[PDB]
A = this chain, B = another copy of it.
């Protein structure tokens, strides 16, 4: 339970993709337990099939959910006995090498969101914010780019945030349910307000693959027409609810010294 993390993977109409990723994550070092947040209402969980294929390196708890909400994976699960939580979308495969190193980074910055997918917010109209990535001009000062968020769907964060999240303003919970989007944007707001530091630190993945297309079922949430537009919306809504833009920019990109070999020179 000490020096270990808990994998929280929410899955929706991607059971085939899920079983494949589960075979991967179960074998990662420092993994204490896995919590599958089953969002397939009225659909028989896979646990049975999962046991017939045992033994497994660690315990895997399949929690059926009331409704299919993006927030479900943010509840305070009693079976989480680790200080750190590893949250991954059920369509992403992060190499063990990336997890071990990133987790070791999280331990040096437990109060921050350590992940592999960085994003930013920009502003052009005094007070009006927009959501985006490196395709948008750097809001930042001089050189390079900046990021003010790390998406929780590929990250390590202190499990006490799930608690802190629950204690957040009702309007925020409402906002997440109303859109079934921007739950990670909320978490980033929540974290930075709590620490006063950038909500996250970006760890460049040496081997992370997205399996979106390799699945029977839905194409994926970010392909919806109003996805991005919906995200810019959320940032502005949160600024209203919290009455202020808390996100702070950062341009720190951490890579593993010497992995690959001689990448320092």
A residues with CB within 8 A of B = 97, 100-101, 104-105, 108, 118, 134, 138, 142-147, 202, 204, 250-265
Contacts and interface: CB of A to CB of B under 8 A. Distances in A.
A264 B138 CA distance: 14
B252 A105 contact: yes
19 contacts: A97-B143, A100-B142, A134-B262, A134-B264, A134-B265, A138-B258, A143-B256, A143-B259, A144-B259, A145-B259, A145-B261, A147-B257, A204-B255, A251-B256, A253-B254, A253-B255, A253-B256, A253-B263, A254-B255
A257 B200 CA distance: 13
- For A108, A143, A202, the residue with the greatest tally of chain B CB atoms inside 10 Å of its CB is A143
Contacts of A259: 143-145, 251
Nearest to A198: B108
A257 B251 contact: yes
Contact of A252 (B138, B257, B260): B257
- For A100, A138, A147, A204, the residue with the greatest tally of chain B CB atoms inside 10 Å of its CB is A204
Count the copies: 2
Contacts of A251: 101, 104, 256-259
A264 B249 CA distance: 16
A260 B138 CA distance: 13
A121 to B, nearest CB: 15
A252 B254 contact: yes
A143 B100 contact: yes
Given A100-B143, A101-B143, A257 B253 contact: yes
A22 B69 CA distance: 61
B202 A118 contact: no
A256 to B, nearest CB: 5
A120 B250 CA distance: 28
A256 B134 CA distance: 13
A142 B98 CA distance: 12
A14 B145 CA distance: 38
Given A118-B264, A144-B257, 16 more contacts: A104-B251, A118-B257, A134-B264, A138-B258, A144-B258, A144-B260, A145-B261, A145-B264, A146-B257, A202-B264, A251-B259, A252-B257, A253-B255, A253-B257, A253-B263, A254-B254
B258 A255 contact: no
